[PDB]
Amino acid sequence: KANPVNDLCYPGDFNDYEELKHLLSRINHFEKIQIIPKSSWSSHEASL
Amino acid sequence: GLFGAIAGFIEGGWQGMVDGWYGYHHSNEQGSGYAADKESTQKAIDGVTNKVNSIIDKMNTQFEAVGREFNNLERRIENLNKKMEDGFLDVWTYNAELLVLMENERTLDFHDSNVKNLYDKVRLQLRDNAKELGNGCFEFYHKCDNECMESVRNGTYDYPQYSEEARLKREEIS
Amino acid sequence: GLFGAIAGFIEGGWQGMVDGWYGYHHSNEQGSGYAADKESTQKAIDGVTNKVNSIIDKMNTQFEAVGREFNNLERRIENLNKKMEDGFLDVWTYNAELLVLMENERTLDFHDSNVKNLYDKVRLQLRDNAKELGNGCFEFYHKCDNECMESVRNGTYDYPQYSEEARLKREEIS
Amino acid sequence: GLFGAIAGFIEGGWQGMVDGWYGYHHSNEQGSGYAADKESTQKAIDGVTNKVNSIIDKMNTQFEAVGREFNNLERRIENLNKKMEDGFLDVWTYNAELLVLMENERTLDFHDSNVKNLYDKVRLQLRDNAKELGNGCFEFYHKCDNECMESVRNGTYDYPQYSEEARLKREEIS
Ligand SMILES: *[C@@H]1O[C@H](CO)[C@@H](O)[C@H](O)[C@H]1NC(C)=O
Ligand SMILES: *[C@@H]1O[C@H](CO)[C@@H](O)[C@H](O)[C@H]1NC(C)=O
Numbered sequence: 073k074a075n076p077v078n079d080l081c082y083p084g085d086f087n088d089y090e091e092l093k094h095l096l097s098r099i100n101h102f103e104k105i106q107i108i109p110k111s112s113w114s115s116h117e118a119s120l
Numbered sequence: 121g122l123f124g125a126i127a128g129f130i131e132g133g134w135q136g137m138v139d140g141w142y143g144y145h146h147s148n149e150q151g152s153g154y155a156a157d158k159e160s161t162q163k164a165i166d167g168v169t170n171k172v173n174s175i176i177d178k179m180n181t182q183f184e185a186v187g188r189e190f191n192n193l194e195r196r197i198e199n200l201n202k203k204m205e206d207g208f209l210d211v212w213t214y215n216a217e218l219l220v221l222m223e224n225e226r227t228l229d230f231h232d233s234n235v236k237n238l239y240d241k242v243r244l245q246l247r248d249n250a251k252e253l254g255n256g257c258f259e260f261y262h263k264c265d266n267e268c269m270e271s272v273r274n275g276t277y278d279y280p281q282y283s284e285e286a287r288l289k290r291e292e293i294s
Numbered sequence: 295g296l297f298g299a300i301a302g303f304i305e306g307g308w309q310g311m312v313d314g315w316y317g318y319h320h321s322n323e324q325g326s327g328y329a330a331d332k333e334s335t336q337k338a339i340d341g342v343t344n345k346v347n348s349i350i351d352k353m354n355t356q357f358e359a360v361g362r363e364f365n366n367l368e369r370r371i372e373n374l375n376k377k378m379e380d381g382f383l384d385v386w387t388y389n390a391e392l393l394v395l396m397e398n399e400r401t402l403d404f405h406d407s408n409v410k411n412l413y414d415k416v417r418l419q420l421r422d423n424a425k426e427l428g429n430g431c432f433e434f435y436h437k438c439d440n441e442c443m444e445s446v447r448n449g450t451y452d453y454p455q456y457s458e459e460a461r462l463k464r465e466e467i468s
Numbered sequence: 469g470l471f472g473a474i475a476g477f478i479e480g481g482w483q484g485m486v487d488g489w490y491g492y493h494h495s496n497e498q499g500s501g502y503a504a505d506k507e508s509t510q511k512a513i514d515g516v517t518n519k520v521n522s523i524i525d526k527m528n529t530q531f532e533a534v535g536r537e538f539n540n541l542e543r544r545i546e547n548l549n550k551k552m553e554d555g556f557l558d559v560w561t562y563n564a565e566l567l568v569l570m571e572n573e574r575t576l577d578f579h580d581s582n583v584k585n586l587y588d589k590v591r592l593q594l595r596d597n598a599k600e601l602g603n604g605c606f607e608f609y610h611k612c613d614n615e616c617m618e619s620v621r622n623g624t625y626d627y628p629q630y631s632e633e634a635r636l637k638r639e640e641i642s
């Protein structure tokens with residue numbers, strides 16, 4: 073939509089946001105992978 | 121109508137002529153009716169169809185607008201993109217309208233010549249034998265059959281034989 | 295002059311003709327002078343005026359240059375903007391010049407047909423009664439009044455009555 | 469061929485005519501051959517050469533592509549530059565093709581009128597003296613020398629003298 077309702081829930085800015093949307097025009101598939109699994113942060117606390 | 125064939129000499133169309141575009145009306149002893157000659161209407165069909173394709177073929181390469189977005193801090197570029205995209209559309213919509221406007225005039229004028237030249241050859245074949253009335257009508261002298269009308273229709277009008285009977289008909293009215 | 299009406303048959307214009315564009319010159323027993331027919335010059339006026347407006351109407355949508363400025367560290371964009379703005383002007387100045395160049399030829403050729411077709415109908419009405427000199431002049435046979443000249447002017451030339459006196463004049467010179 | 473001069477009346481060209489574009493073929497007692505009139509072919513040469521230069525002269529101002537480079541982090545501008553440069557080329561290649569396509573039709577139609585009007589003036593000079601065959605041939609009556617053919621060629625055909633001998637030849641065949 074022209075005016076999205078749920079965009080960047082937490083306040084802030086997306087760096088090079090328009091640069092990324094240009095790349096999405098040429099990509100037809102996306103897949104999720106476990107680059108850094110959760111529960112692997114034993115020192116810092118991730119859930120809270 | 122620059123050539124004047126449409127209106128001018130012949131200002132009335134034939135609603136009964138549905139077989140083709142250009143044809144001849146015969147009113148002789150063996151009835152009357154409308155008939156068509158293929159060599160004239162076929163070239164017009166081929167010429168117009170080639171023109172119609174040519175408009176489509178030439179317009180194959182055209183500007184295609186694409187979406188670009190900016191981050192509210194670069195408005196000179198956004199204005200530059202906006203003025204470029206609609207500027208190209210304005211250029212291309214003028215070419216399409218101008219091309220359509222000119223080719224409409226060509227087709228109407230092209231049809232003028234074909235019927236005009238169709239009249240010219242019939243006058244050039246009949247010559248002294250017939251009289252020119254003014255609305256495209258020819259009134260010949262010889263009392264031949266309907267085949268002579270077809271002879272006019274295939275463009276094969278032999279002059280000499282018909283001249284003697286017609287010249288006997290040029291001296292009895294004079 | 296493709297149709298050949300300007301120059302060709304009639305190579306000399308009439309400076310005394312200020313009432314209209316196309317007209318007839320009569321030289322008979324009841325004096326001489328120039329007169330105009332409205333049905334020919336009015337259509338030319340309407341056609342040309344429509345053409346003049348059409349050039350203005352079609353050219354309503356055109357590129358409009360706007361000012362953009364850059365900070366001496368972005369010269370690729372400034373060069374891009376400079377080449378885009380003058381590039382559009384170069385495209386649009388070619389369309390305007392080409393349109394004017396072609397429509398100038400149309401008006402001259404359109405005027406050729408109107409006077410040519412005006413000659414064609416007068417020959418088609420007079421036919422055997424008059425003789426064709428070569429410079430557009432017709433020399434008819436009947437000794438009628440100036441109203442017959444007006445009859446030629448309103449395009450209402452009845453043939454039969456005038457044929458008998460003219461054919462008596464085709465046999466006395468032969 | 470809108471005017472119909474090419475093909476139509478004269479459907480066969482002359483391979484033996486290499487001196488010029490338009491000319492006359494004479495077949496009389498003093499031999500036969502081909503001859504040219506300069507006033508017709510010179511104007512065609514000047515008109516066509518002016519047209520050829522006009523295409524080059526008008527196309528002097530055109531978009532010139534220039535190289536610009538970007539640093540892989542600004543692709544919206546690179547896409548904008550790429551679409552602008554090839555977009556202008558697409559606009560200009562359409563103008564060049566359309567201009568060539570239309571001016572090709574002009575030259576063919578311009579040549580139609582010149583030979584058509586060349587025929588028209590010869591018919592307008594000979595008139596009753598000759599007969600119209602159909603393929604552009606004129607068969608006059610008077611038994612004059614080859615100079616009369618040149619008289620037709622310089623467009624100076626005095627009518628009266630030749631009328632009396634021809635009218636004596638219009639009454640012996642009738
Ligand atoms: C039609 O014209 C062609 C021209 O060659 C001729 O062969 C044919 O006989 C004509 N038709 C008739 C019925 O004569
Ligand atoms: C002019 O032409 C019209 C054509 O209908 C005719 O009614 C009128 O009588 C003509 N003028 C004169 C003076 O005859």
Ligand SMILES: *[C@@H]1O[C@H](CO)[C@@H](O)[C@H](O)[C@H]1NC(C)=O
Pocket residue numbers: 618619622623624
């Ligand atoms: C050619 O035409 C010109 C026209 O003025 C004339 O002067 C000249 O005598 C003509 N040529 C001949 C051989 O008569």
